[PDB]
Amino acid sequence: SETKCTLKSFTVEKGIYQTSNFRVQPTESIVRFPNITNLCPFGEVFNATRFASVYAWNRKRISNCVADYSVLYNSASFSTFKCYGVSPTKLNDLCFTNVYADSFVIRGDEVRQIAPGQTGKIADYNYKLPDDFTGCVIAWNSNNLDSKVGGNHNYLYRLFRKSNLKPFERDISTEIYQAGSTPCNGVKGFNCYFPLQSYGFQPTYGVGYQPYRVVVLSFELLHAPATVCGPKKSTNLVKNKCVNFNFNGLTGTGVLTESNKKFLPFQQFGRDIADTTDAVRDPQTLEILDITPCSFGGVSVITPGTNTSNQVAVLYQGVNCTEVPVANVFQTRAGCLIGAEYVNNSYECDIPIGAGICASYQT
Amino acid sequence: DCTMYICGDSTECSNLLLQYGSFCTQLNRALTGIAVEQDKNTQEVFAQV
């Protein structure tokens, strides 16, 4: 039927016809990545003995590390994880340039004001967010340790401020604010307000009044080469089976076999004259491997006259038949031929095949 | 080969190649004419006897 359709006719003449080129599908997809070691210590960030306060939130830079967000996400110690700029699931996928972490302790009542595009005391006095806040916010409660029976008065918050400051702006001015018209001089007086007021956390406080440690991991976009991002997953290694191999971010197909070539300590790739990849180095165990895209061919249907007979033969041009059952046997220089019997008599050629082999229709 | 050279092992690429029509069939016929003609040359010179 393949020949009868390709020729676009219901009559098929004697000869050999070319149709239905052959390939081999791969099995699975394999990924290899290095031992991922350079992870920055988020443990000392999360388990710090004392966090900064909301008036003077600390700014810390995180660079050239692996920010493993899986441990952060799957941990149940967190109370909420609201993350606005990007999807929380894809944090470890896209690789980022730099991350700045702001750590502070606030009440649970003002947790709403942390969100972008929100109004509140801490959303208008100290902590400001842009309309396009891309950073990622984390919050959890640590009442048992943070709260003091006598009241932990070390923490402070901005009571009265002169104006609403721009996002990512920290102020140190603790001068006596002048809410009234008359100027204020000295330490106290009429309409003389201290800009900072103290938190008092007690175990008797309910939800909202309890101390909540809130940390935001803001980041900047593509003004420098990306270096900070999560881990790259790695799977087991397989050989002698053509697969969709992915080494260090290059994709391809072929059988991975052991190669006796010797590279240089820093060399990674292997290439031939025709400028294509033929070798690769495993990013975990330093070894030299050879690649070979899984094989492929076509189909040559040998048939006599349609009126004479309808039996056909299939020859795969230049294809070894040790892998034939993917789609009588005989192996020749032109390939492996099936469907026809080999004899020892010698007649004249009727349908050429190759390398001296000539098929025909005879008893 | 028709699509292995241009859109090998890619399902998406073979879709846009098919829109060009009979370029695939015509090209394969052109190469076959040259290949078959070569056996005519060798037969014509040496098979005098």
């Binding site: 032109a334 390398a355 | 028709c2 056996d39 040496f46």
Partner: peptide
Amino acid sequence: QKFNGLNVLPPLLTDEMIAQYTSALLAGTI
């Protein structure tokens, strides 16, 4: 045989087979 679909076919007459014609031609003319 190659990577990107390219294939080379063997000739119908083997290199030894054409050596029989040359000997036959030279034997007849001698």
